[PDB]
Design a protein around this nucleic acid. Structure first.
Lengths: 53, 496
DNA sequence: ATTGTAGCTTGGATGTTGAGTCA
DNA sequence: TTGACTCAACATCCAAAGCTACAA
């Protein structure tokens, strides 16, 4: 249940700028407490999210 | 001391997972980019005809090895001309994709930084011009080999932060930091050799070698310094056909004893989680090559054998030290040790090593009832153990136990209940065949309101202060034909 | 008031972690 | 440069259906 802007940033970093992962994930995981439980139970959903567009 | 809180422990485990997933997705996407047609038509022109023929030698019946030979020579010549192609190599701006410390990750959020974006087109342009860090270099190389229609994998040694490192201060030695970090690569290449039926390891940029890994690999980092930024635990292979295979086994000499400790897979949950990620990234059907590689991994597993040190046998997936057999375990009849351990530090001191497949777990009668099992007629106990005010508890094996079948409910749906007026239901087995368990805070109030025949369900035991255990009545066992009636009452509880 | 309830101060055995010492 | 010790501070697993005093 994330925004368009964050999923866009995440895909752009993952695809071409993964050296910048550390601070982005710091921000996102600090702003999305729910993400923890999502990753733990449904990692494939997250993967496919990133794999779209 | 120097150990952080448990909250930090869990935060590090979660961040480790998240980071790993992101890295693996990065490898997938980069492997897509590598498949770009626009790029391959350009890189194809870098490989002379002679070399193409060497990369696709004629099948040699009498002695397939000679063909392997010609293949390897082509790969070598490809490596040579790749040096000619690239020319400019850039340094990694900040540790590239080598492992970062927790302190570094903590402070990275502290200070923001401008990041020059790399789009697919930028990647293609950089690879064609021959400009970039060693990672982009090797990636281009894999793209070239693929342009020449050879089955070349991109290999990524994923370096998430180490969730086993529980230190607060995680400082690193600055002396030769970069040189030690770049001593071994993060990305390299694997090429399938159809003649010998093995993956050949190729690092054309960093170590500039080709090897046919048997037991030892030149690419696994060695030395405490080097393993502080390069902890080999997730070596991932991406192929032409968008496959994704965990290939650590090839490059880790001690997968089962050492590496396992440092992997999220060390427990059942992480095992399933990682299998889910792989599957999510594995976009192809199984091939015969997979079968060959699995046989290779199986032989590598067979020949890793018992580890040389006591620590490496703590929580080993296959072996247990005699002294680590729990008080509630026995050696399966007729079995013995499967090996020994020379104890480093004591002359002629030796420990007995058992295969875990040969250790049986025993439980007492009560414990079995807690697993919905009673003892068979004339079962004899296998072990006797103390407890507290002491007490001699007998232990039995699974084979001495039987599945408990509770009596059926009557026609009217009346359940037969224990001395406290409750039914104990610790296992699905323990629900009567013609009954169902309804778990709900108000399932009791509901069944009482309908005046129907039920039985409160004791599903577990709450341990609480004072000194006293308490039963957890989480719901109701009713006959099956009354389920929806109960479910209706439950749904309308506000109206009672 | 002869019942309803707040309060009693999970624990005890066993494993994990990093630091340090030794051979 | 190796690993087997020990130390101490937590963490984690696992048992498995109360008891007293006192206010109302």
């Amino acid at each position: 249940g994330l925004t368009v802007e964050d999923l866009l940033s995440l895909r752009q970093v993952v695809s071409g700028n993964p050296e910048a992962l550390a601070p982005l994930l710091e921000n996102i995981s600090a702003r999305y407490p729910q993400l923890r439980e999502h990753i733990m139970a449904n990692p494939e959903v997250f993967v496919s999210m990133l794999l779209e567009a | 001391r120097n150990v952080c809180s448990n909250e930090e422990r869990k935060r590090r485990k979660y961040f480790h997972m998240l980071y790993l997933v992101c890295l693996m997705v990065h490898g997938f996407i980069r492997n897509e980019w590598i498949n770009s047609k626009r790029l391959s038509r350009k890189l194809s022109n870098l490989v002379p005809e002679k070399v193409f023929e060497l990369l696709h030698p004629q099948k040699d019946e009498e002695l397939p090895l000679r063909s392997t030979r010609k293949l390897l020579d082509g790969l070598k010549k490809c490596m040579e001309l790749w040096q000619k192609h690239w020319k400019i190599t850039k340094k990694y701006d900040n540790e590239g994709l080598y492992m970062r410390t927790w302190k570094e990750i903590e402070m990275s959020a502290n200070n923001k930084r401008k990041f020059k974006t790399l789009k697919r087109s930028d990647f293609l342009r950089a690879v064609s011009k021959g400009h970039g860090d060693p990672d982009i270099s090797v990636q281009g190389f894999v793209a070239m080999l693929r342009a020449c229609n050879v089955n070349a994998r991109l290999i990524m040694s994923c370096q998430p932060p180490d969730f086993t490192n529980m230190k607060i201060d995680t400082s690193l030695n600055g002396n030769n930091a970069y040189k030690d970090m770049v001593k071994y690569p993060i990305f390299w290449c694997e090429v399938w050799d159809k003649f010998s039926k093995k993956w050949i390891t190729v690092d054309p940029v960093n170590l500039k070698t080709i090897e046919q890994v048997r037991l030892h690999s030149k690419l696994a980092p060695k030395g405490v310094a080097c393993c502080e930024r390069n902890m080999l635990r997730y070596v991932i292979a991406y192929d032409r056909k968008y496959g994704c295979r965990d290939v650590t086994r090839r490059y880790a000499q001690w997968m089962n004893s050492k590496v396992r400790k440092r992997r999220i897979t060390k427990d059942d949950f992480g095992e399933k989680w990682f299998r889910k990620v792989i599957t999510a990234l594995h976009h192809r059907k199984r091939t015969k090559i997979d079968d060959y590689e699995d046989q290779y991994f199986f032989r590598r597993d067979e020949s890793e054998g018992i580890p040389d040190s006591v620590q490496d046998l703590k929580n080993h997936p296959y072996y247990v030290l005699e002294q680590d057999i729990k008080q509630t375990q026995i050696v399966k009849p007729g079995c013995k040790e499967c090996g020994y351990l020379k104890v480093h530090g004591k002359v002629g001191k030796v420990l007995k090593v058992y295969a875990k497949r040969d250790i049986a777990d025993l439980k007492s009668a009560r414990q079995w009832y807690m697993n919905g099992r009673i003892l068979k007629t004339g079962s004899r106990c296998k072990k006797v153990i103390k407890r507290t005010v002491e007490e001699d508890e007998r232990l039995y094996s699974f084979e001495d136990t039987e599945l408990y079948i509770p009596p059926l409910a009557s026609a009217s749906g009346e359940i037969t209940k224990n001395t406290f007026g409750n039914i104990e239901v610790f296992a699905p087995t323990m629900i009567p065949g013609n009954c169902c368990l309804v778990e709900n805070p108000v399932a009791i109030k509901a069944a009482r309101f309908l005046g129907v025949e039920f039985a409160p369900a004791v599903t577990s035991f709450k341990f609480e202060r004072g000194s006293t255990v308490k039963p957890v009545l989480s719901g109701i066992v009713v006959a099956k034909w009354l389920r929806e009636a109960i479910e209706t009452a439950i749904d309308g509880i506000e109206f009672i």
